[PDB]
Amino acid sequence: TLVHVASVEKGRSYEDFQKVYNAIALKLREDDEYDNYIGYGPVLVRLAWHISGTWDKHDNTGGSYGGTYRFKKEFNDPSNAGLQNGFKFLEPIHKEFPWISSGDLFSLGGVTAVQEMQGPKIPWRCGRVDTPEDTTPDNGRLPDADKDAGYVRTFFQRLNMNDREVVALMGAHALGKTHLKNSGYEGPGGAANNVFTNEFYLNLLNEDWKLEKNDANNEQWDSKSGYMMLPTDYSLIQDPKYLSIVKEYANDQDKFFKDFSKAFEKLLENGITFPKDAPSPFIFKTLEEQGL
Ligand code: HEM
């Protein structure tokens, strides 16, 4: 398996990264019209996950380290359709801060989005290093949505995630929406789709779901409230082990926040070796905490 050692951008420290965080956060506030006023928060979270979710624990291919989403093979992955919006959002950030690596920028985008949307603090570590075009993972490593709980469970073993980690991570599906033109699925998972809450779990348990076909001829679960769940989302209440965890997070906001924070940091760090003398993880202040 490949070794990717975190290497701090030369001479940079917490304050440098807080400035990048702030620039992302200010642009999130400014560019509010995007996606019928959802804003860019959700797509940045999805970008951070997709650049990380190519990882394979077996050989340390893929993962956030190399920033390989910048290469055509990966940005043109059908699984990544729509993420170009997140990349374009981050372009002026990268122009202002050309010293940050691509993997650091993409992952920090996700952290910033979660926190600015009132989610948990997510500790974040710098030191991802851009790797060459030939290190770009092939398409097909990101998950299908038309599958069942067994598929989800097996899929996430490749990312070294257990049942609790999987169910926690999936709570991000409160954010944003599915777009028919991107993925063949349409609609949001709830009402508060640019605020980070545990609504995904409450909606799974409390809505009256009907298995319908959308306009792309794909099945999805729909409620009269106008919400949807992917087959993979709904699988979390079909499987008895996932169901107990869904109930736990539906009943404990703080526990969900803490578990999501750990799993999301882990996701963003998979594949990276941090030297023993590497800086401790950074916890960035929100704009609100800074009075900005
Ligand atoms: C079985 C695993 C998963 C599947 C099958 C899946 C599938 C999907 C699909 C089909 C979409 C709609 C894309 C579009 O039409 O624009 C989506 C959106 C999204 N996903 Fe996932 N996802 C999974 C796990 C995750 C994880 C682990 C996270 C992050 C922790 C995540 C975060 C998001 C977010 C934030 C959106 C909304 C994007 C937007 O509004 O532009 N997903 N997902």
Side-chain angles (χ1 to χ4, degrees), residues 42-71 73-75:
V43 74
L44 291 182
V45 174
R46 202 193 194 221
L47 178 63
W49 138 240
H50 276 206
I51 63 96
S52 300
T54 58
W55 187 60
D56 186 340
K57 70 179 177 182
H58 299 98
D59 58 10
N60 195 203
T61 55
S64 71
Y65 184 86
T68 54
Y69 174 87
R70 75 192 189 276
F71 296 118
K73 183 172 70 174
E74 188 170 344
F75 72 66

Side-chain angles (χ1 to χ4, degrees), residues 3-14 16-71 73-87 89-94 96-106:
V3 183
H4 291 318
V5 184
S7 182
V8 177
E9 288 93 334
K10 181 69 173 166
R12 304 289 168 178
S13 61
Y14 177 76
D16 295 279
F17 298 100
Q18 180 76 70
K19 288 177 188 171
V20 181
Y21 177 108
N22 287 357
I24 295 165
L26 287 161
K27 192 180 174 62
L28 278 172
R29 178 189 283 169
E30 177 62 24
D31 298 350
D32 68 322
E33 299 188 32
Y34 173 77
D35 206 357
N36 294 300
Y37 291 88
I38 295 168
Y40 280 94
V43 74
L44 291 182
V45 174
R46 202 193 194 221
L47 178 63
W49 138 240
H50 276 206
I51 63 96
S52 300
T54 58
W55 187 60
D56 186 340
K57 70 179 177 182
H58 299 98
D59 58 10
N60 195 203
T61 55
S64 71
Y65 184 86
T68 54
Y69 174 87
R70 75 192 189 276
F71 296 118
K73 183 172 70 174
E74 188 170 344
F75 72 66
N76 288 331
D77 186 349
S79 300
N80 287 161
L83 293 182
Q84 303 94 331
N85 294 118
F87 185 84
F89 175 99
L90 294 172
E91 281 188 306
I93 308 298
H94 214 169
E96 184 175 359
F97 304 97
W99 53 263
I100 195 167
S101 68
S102 292
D104 280 359
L105 183 59
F106 304 148

Side-chain angles (χ1 to χ4, degrees), residues 262-275 277-281:
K262 288 179 190 156
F264 196 64
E265 181 178 9
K266 176 179 167 176
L267 179 74
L268 274 46
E269 292 174 2
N270 274 336
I272 309 172
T273 298
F274 293 97
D277 59 349
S280 301

Side-chain angles (χ1 to χ4, degrees), residues 7 44 52 54 76 112 127 146 173 205 209 212 216 246 290:
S7 182
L44 291 182
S52 300
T54 58
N76 288 331
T112 304
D146 63 341
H173 279 176
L205 295 174
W209 299 105
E212 304 182 331
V246 168
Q290 293 167 272

Side-chain angles (χ1 to χ4, degrees), residues 111-180 182-186:
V111 167
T112 304
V114 171
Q115 297 195 173
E116 291 298 303
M117 292 190 289
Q118 307 161 233
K121 290 306 185 93
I122 318 288
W124 178 88
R125 303 185 84 162
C126 72
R128 297 166 189 77
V129 178
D130 285 18
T131 58
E133 192 155 16
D134 65 359
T135 68
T136 305
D138 286 346
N139 297 174
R141 293 168 172 234
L142 294 161
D144 295 333
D146 63 341
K147 303 282 195 291
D148 64 11
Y151 170 86
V152 172
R153 180 169 285 119
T154 298
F155 175 87
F156 274 102
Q157 287 168 352
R158 202 199 71 220
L159 296 175
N160 191 38
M161 298 295 180
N162 67 20
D163 282 5
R164 179 167 295 282
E165 293 167 318
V166 169
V167 176
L169 287 167
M170 215 76 72
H173 279 176
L175 304 170
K177 68 187 289 290
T178 64
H179 309 84
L180 204 76
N182 288 342
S183 64
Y185 296 98
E186 178 64 37

